[PDB]
Amino acid sequence: ARKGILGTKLGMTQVFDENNKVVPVTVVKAGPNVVTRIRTTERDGYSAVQLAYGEISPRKVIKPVAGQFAAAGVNPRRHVAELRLDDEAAVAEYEVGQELTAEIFSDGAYVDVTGTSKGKGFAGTMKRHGFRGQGAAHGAQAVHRRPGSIGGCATPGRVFKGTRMSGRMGNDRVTTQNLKVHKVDAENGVLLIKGAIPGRNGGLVVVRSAIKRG
Amino acid sequence: SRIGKQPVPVPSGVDVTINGQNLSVKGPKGTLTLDVAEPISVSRAEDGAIVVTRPDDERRSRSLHGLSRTLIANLVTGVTEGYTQKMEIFGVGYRVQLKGQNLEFALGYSHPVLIEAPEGITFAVESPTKFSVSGIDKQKVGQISAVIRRLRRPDPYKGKGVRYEGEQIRRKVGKT
Amino acid sequence: PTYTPKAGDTTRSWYVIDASDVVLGRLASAAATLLRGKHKPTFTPNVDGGDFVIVINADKIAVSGDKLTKKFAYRHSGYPGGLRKRTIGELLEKHPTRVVENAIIGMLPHNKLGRQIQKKLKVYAGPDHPHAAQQPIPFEIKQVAQ
Amino acid sequence: MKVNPSVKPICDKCRVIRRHGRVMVICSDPRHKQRQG
Amino acid sequence: AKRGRKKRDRKHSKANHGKRPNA
Amino acid sequence: RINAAARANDITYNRLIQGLKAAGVEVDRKNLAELAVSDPAAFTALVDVARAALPEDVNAPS
RNA sequence: CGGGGGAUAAGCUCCGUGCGUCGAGAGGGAAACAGCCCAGAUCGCCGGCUAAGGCCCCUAAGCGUGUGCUAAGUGGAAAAGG
RNA sequence: UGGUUUGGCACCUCGAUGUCGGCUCGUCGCAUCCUGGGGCUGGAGCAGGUCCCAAGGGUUGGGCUGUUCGCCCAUUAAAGCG
RNA sequence: CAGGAUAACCGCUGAAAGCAUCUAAGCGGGAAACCUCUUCCAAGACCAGGCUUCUCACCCUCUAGGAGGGAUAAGGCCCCCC
Ligand SMILES: [Mg+2]
Ligand SMILES: [Mg+2]
Ligand SMILES: [Mg+2]
Ligand SMILES: [Mg+2]
Ligand SMILES: [Mg+2]
Ligand SMILES: [Mg+2]
Ligand SMILES: [Mg+2]
Ligand SMILES: [Mg+2]
Ligand SMILES: [Mg+2]
Ligand SMILES: [Mg+2]
Ligand SMILES: [Mg+2]
Ligand SMILES: [Mg+2]
Ligand SMILES: [Mg+2]
Ligand SMILES: [Mg+2]
Ligand SMILES: [Mg+2]
Ligand SMILES: [Mg+2]
Ligand SMILES: [Mg+2]
Ligand SMILES: [Mg+2]
Ligand SMILES: [Mg+2]
Ligand SMILES: [Mg+2]
Ligand SMILES: [Mg+2]
Ligand SMILES: [Mg+2]
Ligand SMILES: [Mg+2]
Ligand SMILES: [Mg+2]
Ligand SMILES: [Mg+2]
Ligand SMILES: [Mg+2]
Ligand SMILES: [Mg+2]
Ligand SMILES: [Mg+2]
Ligand SMILES: [Mg+2]
Ligand SMILES: [Mg+2]
Ligand SMILES: [Mg+2]
Ligand SMILES: [Mg+2]
Ligand SMILES: [Mg+2]
Ligand SMILES: [Mg+2]
Ligand SMILES: [Mg+2]
Ligand SMILES: [Mg+2]
Ligand SMILES: [Mg+2]
Ligand SMILES: [Mg+2]
Ligand SMILES: [Zn+2]
Numbered sequence: 001a002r003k004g005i006l007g008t009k010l011g012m013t014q015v016f017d018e019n020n021k022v023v024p025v026t027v028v029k030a031g032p033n034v035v036t037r038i039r040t041t042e043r044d045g046y047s048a049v050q051l052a053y054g055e056i057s058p059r060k061v062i063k064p065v066a067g068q069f070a071a072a073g074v075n076p077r078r079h080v081a082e083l084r085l086d087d088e089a090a091v092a093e094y095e096v097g098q099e100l101t102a103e104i105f106s107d108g109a110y111v112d113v114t115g116t117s118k119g120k121g122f123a124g125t126m127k128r129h130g131f132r133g134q135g136a137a138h139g140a141q142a143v144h145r146r147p148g149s150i151g152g153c154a155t156p157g158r159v160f161k162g163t164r165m166s167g168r169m170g171n172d173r174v175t176t177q178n179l180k181v182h183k184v185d186a187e188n189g190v191l192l193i194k195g196a197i198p199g200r201n202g203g204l205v206v207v208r209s210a211i212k213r214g
Numbered sequence: 215s216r217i218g219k220q221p222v223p224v225p226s227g228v229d230v231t232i233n234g235q236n237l238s239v240k241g242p243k244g245t246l247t248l249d250v251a252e253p254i255s256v257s258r259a260e261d262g263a264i265v266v267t268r269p270d271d272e273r274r275s276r277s278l279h280g281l282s283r284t285l286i287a288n289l290v291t292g293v294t295e296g297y298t299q300k301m302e303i304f305g306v307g308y309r310v311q312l313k314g315q316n317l318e319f320a321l322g323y324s325h326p327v328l329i330e331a332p333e334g335i336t337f338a339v340e341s342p343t344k345f346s347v348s349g350i351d352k353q354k355v356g357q358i359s360a361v362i363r364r365l366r367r368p369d370p371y372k373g374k375g376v377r378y379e380g381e382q383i384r385r386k387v388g389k390t
Numbered sequence: 391p392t393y394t395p396k397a398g399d400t401t402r403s404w405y406v407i408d409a410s411d412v413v414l415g416r417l418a419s420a421a422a423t424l425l426r427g428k429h430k431p432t433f434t435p436n437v438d439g440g441d442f443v444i445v446i447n448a449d450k451i452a453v454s455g456d457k458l459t460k461k462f463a464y465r466h467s468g469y470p471g472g473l474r475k476r477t478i479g480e481l482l483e484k485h486p487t488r489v490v491e492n493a494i495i496g497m498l499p500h501n502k503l504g505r506q507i508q509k510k511l512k513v514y515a516g517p518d519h520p521h522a523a524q525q526p527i528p529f530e531i532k533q534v535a536q
Numbered sequence: 537m538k539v540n541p542s543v544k545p546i547c548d549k550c551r552v553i554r555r556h557g558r559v560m561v562i563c564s565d566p567r568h569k570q571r572q573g
Numbered sequence: 574a575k576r577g578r579k580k581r582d583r584k585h586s587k588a589n590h591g592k593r594p595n596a
Numbered sequence: 597r598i599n600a601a602a603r604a605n606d607i608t609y610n611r612l613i614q615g616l617k618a619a620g621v622e623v624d625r626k627n628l629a630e631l632a633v634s635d636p637a638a639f640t641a642l643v644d645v646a647r648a649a650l651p652e653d654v655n656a657p658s
Numbered sequence: 659c660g661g662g663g664g665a666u667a668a669g670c671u672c673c674g675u676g677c678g679u680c681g682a683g684a685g686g687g688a689a690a691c692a693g694c695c696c697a698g699a700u701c702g703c704c705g706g707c708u709a710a711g712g713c714c715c716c717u718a719a720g721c722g723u724g725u726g727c728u729a730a731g732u733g734g735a736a737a738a739g740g
Numbered sequence: 741u742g743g744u745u746u747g748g749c750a751c752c753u754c755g756a757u758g759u760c761g762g763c764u765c766g767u768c769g770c771a772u773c774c775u776g777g778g779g780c781u782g783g784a785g786c787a788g789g790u791c792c793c794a795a796g797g798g799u800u801g802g803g804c805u806g807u808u809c810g811c812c813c814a815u816u817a818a819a820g821c822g
Numbered sequence: 823c824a825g826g827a828u829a830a831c832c833g834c835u836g837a838a839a840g841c842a843u844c845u846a847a848g849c850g851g852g853a854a855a856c857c858u859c860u861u862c863c864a865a866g867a868c869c870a871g872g873c874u875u876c877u878c879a880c881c882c883u884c885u886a887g888g889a890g891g892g893a894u895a896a897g898g899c900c901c902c903c904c
Contacts, residue, residue, distance in 0.1 A: 280837035356834040536608040588688040
């Protein structure tokens with residue numbers, strides 16, 4: 001129904017289309033993964049499949065997680081996530097212990113990307129929210145970049161909870177939809193995605209089959 | 215009242231059964247069900263007729279008596295004979311044709327328009343400019359007739375569209 | 391002096407009320423009075439003396455008039471322009487028990503005594519309940535002629 | 537759809553009916569057709 | 574306005590017999 | 597408290613007080629309350645006495 | 659209550675009334691509300707009888723009794739007119 | 741009906757209620773500018789006149805007067821009223 | 823995009839009231855308006871949710887009613903390079 005696969009962001013690079021075009025792409029290493037658990041309606045109340053990724057030494061992991069993985073019947077891994085399906089026929093396809101690779105996708109099929117944004121740190125209003133400052137000369141009094149008026153006078157007499165103003169930004173989940181896929185390399189198990197995707201070098205990223213149009 | 219007083223006749227070739235308030239009728243054309251309003255009771259005459267009686271002469275009873283009588287008459291006549299309607303199309307370059315259970319219209323739009331045929335009804339076409347629709351339930355027949363009629367906007371100038379058998383449309387002439 | 395309740399003289403009980411073809415006002419009044427324990431002769435306002443109650447088959451509640459579409463339950467999240475509304479028909483369609491829960495909550499004092507009291511009520515939608523192990527006693531709404 | 541607080545049978549062919557609490561008159565002549573509100 | 578009509582109309586409660594200070 | 601006890605014993609408070617007045621027993625609300633919390637049998641006896649002393653029809657124009 | 663000034667407007671102003679109240683007045687009644695209704699505080703009592711208003715629960719007392727009207731949440735905002 | 745302009749009353753604030761536009765930043769109503777859906781025409785069609793429902797989004801940049809108001813210069817769907 | 827129920831409007835079957843009528847019983851169509859459908863937060867939601875794995879055992883004291891103190895496993899924290 002809706003296929004999915006984990007991976008990691010690597011960097012940027014160019015590729016030239018057969019029609020002699022130019023299109024920047026991103027390199028994503030969708031490494032092999034394993035299935036550790038399956039969620040069924042009568043057991044949990046929904047349908048989804050659990051995945052795992054990453055190579056870690058056995059002594060790193062903690063004992064409860066090690067025991068869970070041993071009961072599942074696979075070696076330890078670093079990260080774990082799940083894909084939420086919509087029916088029972090689809091989940092019937094997946095079984096515990098199965099191995100998935102990047103081949104599952106085909107070129108020309110639009111997908112979605114999920115990840116975390118950058119860390120920008122505390123920032124001013126004009127930068128975080130794109131306010132417009134005021135005159136930098138002709139009689140300023142050190143109000144070059146501060147917003148200014150904030151609300152009414154005695155009616156109602158508050159700040160109208162939800163007003164847009166200064167505060168920290170970034171470091172949150174962000175997703176983009178219907179991104180074109182250019183080429184797939186089997187031996188290297190890497191993806192070439194047109195455009196730019198969120199995240200940082202050596203970060204975590206999960207890609208899913210397109211919903212809007214796919 | 216005045217219209218509900220007369221018992222509904224029943225022909226020999228129709229079966230009638232009563233189960234409390236619910237009523238079902240079996241005939242050559244098929245069978246149908248019905249639920250009756252509780253304020254009014256229904257009785258069957260031994261002389262092959264149906265009698266509907268009202269307990270009191272207030273407004274609701276006076277209204278429902280005639281409704282029940284006429285509805286019973288309509289359903290019995292429908293199950294006995296049925297209902298059919300004929301349609302005709304006027305204009306230039308207007309056509310219609312039958313494709314299985316589905317029917318398509320050509321009113322001159324850029325793209326063709328198709329109408330699906332729900333259950334219990336059938337469409338019959340004898341000429342490219344005239345067709346007919348048949349069914350058992352008068353309400354369904356009328357609904358489908360209105361839906362087919364409303365395909366094209368009224369045209370009081372050239373009369374292009376679909377018109378009933380005896381239906382006459384007002385026409386006004388534009389000098390300019 | 392007048393009698394007062396001691397540390398451990400209070401005793402509770404289990405009650406169940408059906409809601410098949412009954413009027414919401416009567417059901418709410420009966421539930422409120424039972425919760426408060428006005429019937430028990432050991433009433434004292436300062437300490438609760440209520441009794442457990444179970445309500446079953448909430449979806450069959452009958453309401454007179456056109457209230458199915460002309461009565462509206464309102465609530466507001468808090469941000470500006472966040473006042474959105476729902477109708478009783480959709481409320482029953484989606485959450486059967488919400489209407490009765492809200493009615494009983496409104497039918498009781500809004501102080502913290504009542505806030506603690508509302509813990510005393512459990513309301514269900516289906517004709518069954520997993521609380522059969524405590525042997526609830528059936529109850530019926532009745533009028534005392536005078 | 538002439539909307540006025542008051543309506544009348546402008547010509548003999550106007551007939552008055554009541555719908556959903558609002559009374560309006562229907563007639564063959566559209567000019568003669570109006571509703572109150 | 575709306576404010577004025579309320580107090581004068583609210584004076585017609587049978588409790589006060591219809592006569593109240595300040596209309 | 598008295599109203600609760602009477603309603604439990606299947607008689608209204610107003611009719612109970614009317615019966616007490618008719619029988620001419622002058623005991624006070626505090627006494628009734630204490631007796632009810634203490635002696636349900638005595639409360640029932642008093643209620644029966646009041647019911648017996650009640651007139652025929654409460655709706656009569658008398 | 660009977661009047662003048664006013665646009666027969668003001669919670670406006672100026673008069674007369676063996677006229678009420680507040681001002682110098684607690685309680686109860688109408689959600690809150692000095693000028694409206696009942697009612698004039700010597701003090702104590704874990705006692706009875708009542709005015710105004712109320713008796714589905716909030717909140718004490720009637721989901722009182724008998725005869726009639728209401729389809730509009732009219733009940734719980736107003737006029738020429740239809 | 742609205743209390744939004746010009747007005748009448750002096751009831752709260754002279755041991756202080758700091759003042760017109762502009763800049764930045766909102767929020768709300770509909771008596772609707774477009775965007776949406778209908779109907780009646782002295783509606784060939786494009787295009788017009790009028791009425792009904794509808795508040796999700798948008799509503800430019802310049803010259804002149806401090807100006808509010810107002811006039812003018814070039815496009816877009818519009819350069820909405822409070 | 824698609825689906826559900828709606829305002830303005832267009833309807834089918836129909837007595838009161840032998841006729842007629844979109845209605846008082848019923849059944850239908852109909853929009854950036856409303857509800858799901860898009861992204862994010864979210865069990866301090868006190869009804870404090872659900873599926874799993876890990877340890878599930880050593881003492882003392884007051885007076886044996888419980889509580890307090892000390893010593894441990896799972897884990898966590900402090901310091902250190904980033
Ligand atoms: Mg930005
Ligand atoms: Mg700047
Ligand atoms: Mg400075
Ligand atoms: Mg500066
Ligand atoms: Mg006129
Ligand atoms: Mg006056
Ligand atoms: Mg006077
Ligand atoms: Mg005068
Ligand atoms: Mg004065
Ligand atoms: Mg004077
Ligand atoms: Mg005095
Ligand atoms: Mg006083
Ligand atoms: Mg008082
Ligand atoms: Mg005195
Ligand atoms: Mg008395
Ligand atoms: Mg009295
Ligand atoms: Mg009480
Ligand atoms: Mg009653
Ligand atoms: Mg009567
Ligand atoms: Mg009202
Ligand atoms: Mg009037
Ligand atoms: Mg008239
Ligand atoms: Mg003054
Ligand atoms: Mg003052
Ligand atoms: Mg002052
Ligand atoms: Mg000063
Ligand atoms: Mg100021
Ligand atoms: Mg100023
Ligand atoms: Mg409007
Ligand atoms: Mg238009
Ligand atoms: Mg027009
Ligand atoms: Mg609008
Ligand atoms: Mg919006
Ligand atoms: Mg100048
Ligand atoms: Mg008719
Ligand atoms: Mg008709
Ligand atoms: Mg919890
Ligand atoms: Mg540790
Ligand atoms: Zn006419």
